């Protein structure tokens, strides 16, 4: 602080770093300052954040990000192979 003020804040920025923050769902009005007005009424967490369609809880079920769910019993064999191959490519990228 002292050196920055001495140099009239012409310093060289610090090296960048990454840190984690926790955001708690709350009404957007609370985050604002205290006055007889509010600007936004939404929630602090987006709908994706509250719920993301993920891996199927049941083993026999297959669930995708788009929300489509298929049980392994109903899938035809050609579809099982197609989904298995699609699984391989996704894993290979990651």
């Amino acid at each position: 602080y002292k050196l920055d003020v001495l140099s009239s804040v012409h310093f060289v920025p610090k090296p960048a770093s990454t840190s984690l923050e926790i955001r708690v769902e709350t009404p957007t009005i609370s985050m604002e300052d205290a006055q007889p007005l509010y600007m936004s009424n939404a929630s602090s967490l987006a709908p994706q954040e509250i719920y993301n369609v993920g891996k199927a809880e049941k083993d026999g079920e297959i669930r995708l990000k788009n929300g489509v769910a298929m049980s392994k019993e109903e899938l035809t064999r050609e579809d099982k192979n197609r989904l298995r191959r699609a699984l391989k490519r996704k894993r290979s990228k990651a």
Binding site: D4, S8, H10, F11, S44, L45, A46
Partner: protein, 410 residues
Amino acid sequence: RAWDLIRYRNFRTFTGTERIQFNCLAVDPSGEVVCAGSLDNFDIHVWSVQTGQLLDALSGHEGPVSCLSFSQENSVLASASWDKTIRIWSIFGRSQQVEPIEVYSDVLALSMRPDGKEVAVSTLKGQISIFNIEDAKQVGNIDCRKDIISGRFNQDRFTAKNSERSKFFTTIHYSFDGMAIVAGGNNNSICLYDVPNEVLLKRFIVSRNMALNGTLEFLNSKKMTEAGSLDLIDDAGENSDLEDRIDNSLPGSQRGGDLSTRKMRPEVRVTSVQFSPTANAFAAASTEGLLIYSTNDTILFDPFDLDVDVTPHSTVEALREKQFLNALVMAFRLNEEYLINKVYEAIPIKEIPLVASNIPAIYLPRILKFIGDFAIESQHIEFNLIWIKALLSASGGYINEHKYLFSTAM
């Protein structure tokens, strides 16, 4: 840092690889590209909003980049530097092109026309030069060194007239119509110029506080003594409380610290100026605070196209005779807010479509301005919506042809 106002989250943050201080910023109209400049890099860093990746670094300036702006229509990027030059970057498109334009002195500020066809720059010489972007040739120049009012500081050993401390404008902005420029700097003046005719419409004194250092051009000779200015003597020791007596000032600090750190009086200066998108007003950030100047009161009598026959009495006679269009037009020719309001509310709902279709094109911008200002605080929500519906349907095409005449009203 990008901020999302609906949820108040810093949804993204951009940073250069070499950790450079950023002093200016520009955002694409599409909101998909962000460019920032620095006073120690000489390059313009560009980021992608969706990804956060540094798309590219624009090079070519031989001095620090002082300011940036995207064209709202053409989407070109205009940058100016202390390199005494201006460069127009066509970053979008298959081929990247740069068009440098030379200027007589260091460029301190830059404003982009809403049309996107011209750019104005304030130079260290106290000049506002307007250039044509497509043709890259100068189209106007406004001299401003004489207009600027700069005060002598208590610590200065040289006169204000000979002082070259701030005789230039560090910030400028167009009016949304495109016919006026409002300028400010590290000086006690805000000057409002008219672009097409290159004249000073008006000058505003930012402050009249003798506490601020730069207010006065001439200082009282009684303060001067054999020791020096009586003001420069520090009277902190006289204060009774210890906290007031403590001096935490660093020897050479000029900026970026608390007031206790500086040890010198605050200096009257305007950091930024802008026009109101929706009203005939402008706001200037200064030391004391954000001054807002507006034309709301409208006590002035500024008639348009009067004749002897036009009179406040005559307008009321037209209303009683049920000549609504003539009553409304004569009210506009007088340009009296109360008379416009009286005629506006006296037109029956059945007659609104007939009147709206028959209003002359010259008075169309005036009615739209009145409705917007009147509707925001009035209680007649439905009546105003009926009028707006009639006006847009009747003269929607005309407003489209002239977007910048009707921008603030719309």
